[PDB]
């Protein structure tokens, strides 16, 4: 007998409120859902995880002195092109990148892992435009 | 061609 | 401001305080101001 | 050996109103809100406010004495109010009101005009005496500090803006 492999199913859409949640501990759960390892038919070479919608990403929470000391970094290829942006400056300018960056570093590297990142849709504020897909509110 | 002497 | 690795009281009116993660000596004598560093 | 547990006299008729992390102090001169740790407890008694801490850990002992004074300063602010006096010293140095503003002639090429923020009132009795009056003890001390910095006391001559009661400490220049 060979191991079961699943046909293609229509994937579940899901919603998570980030407000007051801890950054890394929410990301860890989003990654799992995006990989779809919460499903018993999980298969490592196909995008069959869930689509994850996050509202209130601006209201993510962090411990310690990380608002002023966690430095996101960008290198441009040029002499001196190392850019440092502290967490609060990011939260104040592009607050959704905080949780996107956190989730992306926990996803597999490679083509599939990039596809799975695209199934993540993160919004500052209480609202999201995916009402067409009617995502299911999850608690985590 | 110069030398490594 | 004296900046050194060994900061101590220099006179009896010196005060060792810890502000903002650093050890300072403060004093009515401004020569005695010390920061640890 | 304590400040937190010392109760606060409330004059007639000041009202102290308690709320989550805030106390409101209304009195004859105005209102003040005093943000206070939810780890503390502010207790309204007869003509008296008390503060209690819920442990003997260093943070709770520190917020305790802190919260009590903050409220006591506000109770005093809305009744007696707060003031601080500045003495100008220097041969050509003086100050005058221009409407609500404070104008300092303190030896620069130009005069300095300090304008009063809300709750701050400048009183210039004599050309060498300025008073900063308001209910907020912190704000009054901050504005006063600003004014003094405009021309600090000289290290060598009795010249500049001084606090009242501020000693004159000079050193020899020869």
């Amino acid at each position: 007998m060979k191991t079961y492999v699943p046909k293609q199913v229509e994937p579940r859409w899901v919603l998570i409120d980030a407000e007051g949640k801890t950054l890394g501990r929410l990301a860890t759960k989003i990654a799992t859902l995006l990989r779809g390892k919460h499903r018993p038919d999980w298969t490592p070479n196909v995008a069959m995880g869930d689509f994850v919608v996050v509202v209130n990403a601006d209201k993510i929470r962090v411990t310690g002195k990380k608002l002023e000391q966690k430095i996101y970094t960008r290198y441009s290829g040029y002499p001196g092109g190392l850019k440092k942006i502290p967490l609060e400056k990011m939260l104040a300018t592009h607050p959704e990148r905080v949780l996107e960056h956190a989730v992306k570093g926990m996803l597999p590297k490679g083509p599939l892992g990039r596809r799975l990142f695209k199934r993540l849709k993160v919004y500052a504020g209480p609202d999201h435009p995916h009402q067409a897909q009617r995502p299911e509110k999850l608690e985590v | 061609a110069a030398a490594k002497c | 401001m004296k900046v050194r690795a060994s900061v101590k009281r220099i006179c009896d009116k010196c005060k060792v305080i810890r502000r903002h993660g650093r050890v300072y000596v403060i004093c009515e004598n401004p020569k005695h101001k010390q920061r640890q560093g | 050996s304590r400040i937190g547990r010392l109760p606060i006299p409330v004059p007639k008729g000041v009202s102290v109103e308690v709320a989550p992390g805030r106390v409101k102090v209304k009195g004859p001169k105005g209102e003040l809100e005093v943000p206070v740790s939810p780890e503390m407890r502010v207790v309204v008694e007869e003509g008296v406010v008390r503060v209690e801490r819920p442990s003997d850990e260093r943070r709770h002992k520190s917020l305790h004495g802190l919260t009590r004074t903050l409220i006591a300063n506000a109770v005093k602010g809305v009744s007696e109010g707060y003031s601080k006096e500045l003495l100008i010293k220097g041969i050509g140095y003086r100050a005058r009101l221009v409407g609500r503003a404070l104008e300092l002639t303190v030896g620069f090429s130009h005069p300095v005009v300090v304008e009063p923020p809300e709750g701050i009132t400048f009183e210039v009795p004599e050309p060498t005496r300025v008073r900063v009056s308001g209910i907020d003890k912190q704000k009054v001390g901050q504005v006063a500090a600003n004014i003094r910095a405009i021309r600090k006391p000289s290290a060598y001559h009795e010249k500049g803006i001084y606090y009242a009661g501020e000693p004159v400490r000079l050193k020899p220049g020869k």
Binding site: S76, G77, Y78, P79, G81 | - | - | -
Partner: protein
């Protein structure tokens, strides 16, 4: 923030208070408002200006429809002036008064493939003392095994000019409104007959 489209006419100089004033003449007027960008519809504020009337025989149907929605004769050039909401439906040189300071944007003259000396003011090589076929060469472009490569943005030979250049804070010497003429003190990018854009200065 006001602006207008124009054409570089040429240089001359005038006399003003017993001084020669180098000027560049610009023909700026008149520019019909063809579309206004609004926060509601476009997310920002700007006025799409027209400039120079065009032979309607050369204006295809997508563009003809665009002019029609404005009731405006077909125009050669469409450029937006950003953050500008003129009152009327036409912009003329009158928006500038003598004494004001303007920013002028044009397309510089194109040097084509340009050497490191013309393009980047490099020193080149010596012309005698044994210099061997390197008189206009750039010299070293790197280090050795560390980093073992050449930086991005490295100054090298390549195309030069025919690029957008803005020269800033130019004095409006005169405005001759009957000819749609603006006179600006100093130099302005590009060749005679080039398209230019005249904005109120951002210098203060």
């Amino acid at each position: 923030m006001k602006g207008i489209l124009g054409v570089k006419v040429g240089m001359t100089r005038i006399f003003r208070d017993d001084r020669a004033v180098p000027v560049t003449v610009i023909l700026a007027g008149p520019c019909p408002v063809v579309q206004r960008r609004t926060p509601e519809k476009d997310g920002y504020t700007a006025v799409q200006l027209g400039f120079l009337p065009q032979n309607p025989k050369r204006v295809n149907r997508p563009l003809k429809g665009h002019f029609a929605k404005a009731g405006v004769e077909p125009v050669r050039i469409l450029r937006e002036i950003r953050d500008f909401n003129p009152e009327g439906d036409t912009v003329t040189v009158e928006i500038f008064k003598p004494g004001e300071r303007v920013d002028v944007t044009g397309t510089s003259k194109g040097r084509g493939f340009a050497g490191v000396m013309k393009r980047w003011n490099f020193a080149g090589g010596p012309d005698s003392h044994g210099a061997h076929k390197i008189h206009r060469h750039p010299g070293s472009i790197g280090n050795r095994k560390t980093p073992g490569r050449v930086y991005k943005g490295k100054k090298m030979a390549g195309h030069y000019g025919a690029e957008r250049v803005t020269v800033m804070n130019l004095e409006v010497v005169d405005v001759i409104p009957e000819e749609n003429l603006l006179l600006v003190k100093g130099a302005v990018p590009g060749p005679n007959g080039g398209l230019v854009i005249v904005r109120e200065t951002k210098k203060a």
